[PDB]
Design a protein around this ligand. Structure first.
Ligand SMILES: [Ca+2]
Ligand SMILES: [Ca+2]
Ligand SMILES: [Ca+2]
Ligand SMILES: [Ca+2]
Ligand SMILES: [Ca+2]
Ligand SMILES: [Ca+2]
Ligand SMILES: [Ca+2]
Lengths: 208, 237
């Protein structure tokens, strides 16, 4: 008689991908689906799939897509999400690749704590005596750790890339028996660096 | 004081925007396709006095080639193809561009994520080489007489999304002109055939219905088609 023409999505992202930042708050509109039906039938938008349906809600008439629970780039970096549009005689579906975008939302975490090391007072200047280690799961500059002492010490230095502690001035057991240094591990995010503190105990032992 | 901080600058992104570099290409793209124009990493591999070292990590199956000096990434697919469809199933490639700052020894990994887009590079395929139905001559108009494309027994297509979903439409048959008039497919997505005109065993006992499956590619002239024949035999009574 007069056969139905099915609707089709028109969003550009179906041809490429959709980028959503991991800091996007629950409740935020993340996009708006767009469809054309030549009959101009009233259209109904939806999301399909168990995984997809818990992350995204879809307003049926307008097609706005909301985030229902928080994304986390550290847990899952991308999804393939299947959307649908239907005209009451038929449902069509199209997948979109969703790339989760990272923000620096993690400070470094130290490993092998507690840090404590015994050294003799005659340890030469330049001797590597200990290695500190922290890791940070954020991408790029936000996951590259730098080490420092806060404040810097006259008796010990720490290699900022490698976390190797060396002795930089002659030790005197009589003047000072133990040191309590604060190691800082920061990432290098440009606008929002994050950092963590850890203690380093250096106990001096005597020869005489 | 942070006086000598300028030396920590090399290996950081020169561009703004988020840390991952994301790009897309079509499947089956040719060897040497430029994946990334320019990584835009501060500093300088090569030249008279290089300030950084660039290399690729987690480059599984060596799909990516780096030019450290120009900071370009290329597709490496000589003697093979980048197939998104089964049985290769390559939907995305993730590699790390490692940048080691020479002066200070810091290491920053710049993640590259490549989204591989599906092309309609496969045609539909009928499970069987031909199809059949028997119908009683007293079968009334409007009855469904064939159902055999149900449940992946008809045409399927290994491509993704609409490139992989099928529409069946009856063709005119020059060797059996009335067959496309006696039978219709009202719902092209199912491919069920219904009787449109009264039958008569005394006048004609066999119809050769030609049915063409096409896939549903966005661009009508990218669509692909396959043809099969449904032979309908009348039974008596
Ligand atoms: Ca319609
Ligand atoms: Ca996170
Ligand atoms: Ca993060
Ligand atoms: Ca971080
Ligand atoms: Ca392919
Ligand atoms: Ca394909
Ligand atoms: Ca196809």
């Amino acid at each position: 008689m007069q056969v139905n023409r099915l609707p089709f999505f028109t969003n550009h992202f179906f041809d490429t991908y959709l980028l959503i930042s991991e800091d996007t708050p629950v409740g935020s509109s993340v996009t708006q689906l767009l469809a054309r039906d030549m009959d101009n039938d009233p259209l109904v938008f939806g999301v399909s799939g168990e995984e997809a349906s818990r992350f995204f809600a879809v307003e049926p008439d307008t097609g706005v897509v909301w985030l229902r629970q928080p994304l986390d780039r550290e847990t899952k970096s991308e999804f393939t999400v299947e959307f649908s549009v239907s005209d009451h005689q038929g449902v069509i579906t199209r997948k979109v690749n969703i790339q989760v975008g990272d923000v620096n939302d993690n400070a470094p975490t130290f490993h092998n704590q507690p840090y404590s090391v015994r050294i003799p007072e005659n340890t030469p200047v330049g001797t590597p005596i200990f290695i500190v280690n922290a890791t940070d799961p954020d991408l790029g500059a936000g996951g590259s750790v730098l080490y420092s002492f806060q404040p810097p010490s006259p008796f010990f230095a720490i290699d900022s890339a490698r976390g190797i502690v060396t002795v930089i001035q002659e030790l005197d057991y009589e003047v000072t028996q133990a040191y309590q240094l604060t190691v800082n591990a920061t990432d290098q995010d440009k606008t929002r660096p994050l950092s963590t503190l850890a203690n380093l105990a250096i106990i001096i032992t005597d020869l005489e | 004081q942070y006086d000598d901080d300028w030396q920590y600058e090399d290996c950081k992104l020169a561009r703004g925007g988020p840390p991952a570099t994301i790009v897309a290409i079509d499947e089956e793209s040719r060897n040497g396709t430029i994946l990334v124009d320019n990584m835009l990493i501060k500093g300088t591999a090569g030249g008279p006095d290089p300030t950084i070292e660039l290399s690729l990590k987690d480059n599984v199956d060596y799909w990516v080639l780096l030019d450290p000096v120009k900071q370009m990434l290329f597709l490496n697919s000589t003697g093979r193809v980048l197939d998104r469809d089964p049985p290769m199933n390559i939907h995305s490639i993730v590699v790390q561009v490692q940048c080691v700052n020479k002066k200070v020894g810091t290491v920053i990994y710049h993640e590259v994520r490549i989204v591989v887009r599906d092309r309609n590079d496969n045609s539909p395929t009928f499970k069987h080489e031909s199809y059949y139905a028997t119908v009683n001559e007293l079968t009334p108009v409007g009855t469904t007489i064939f159902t055999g494309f149900s449940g992946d027994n008809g045409a399927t297509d290994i491509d993704d999304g609409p490139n992989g979903q099928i529409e069946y439409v009856i063709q005119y048959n020059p060797e059996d002109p009335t067959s496309n008039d006696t039978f219709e497919i009202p719902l092209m997505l199912t491919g069920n055939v219904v009787l449109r005109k009264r039958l008569n065993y005394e006048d004609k006992t066999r119809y050769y219905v030609i049915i063409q499956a096409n896939d549903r590619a966005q661009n009508l002239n990218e669509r692909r088609t396959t043809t099969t024949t449904l032979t309908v035999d009348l039974e008596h009574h």
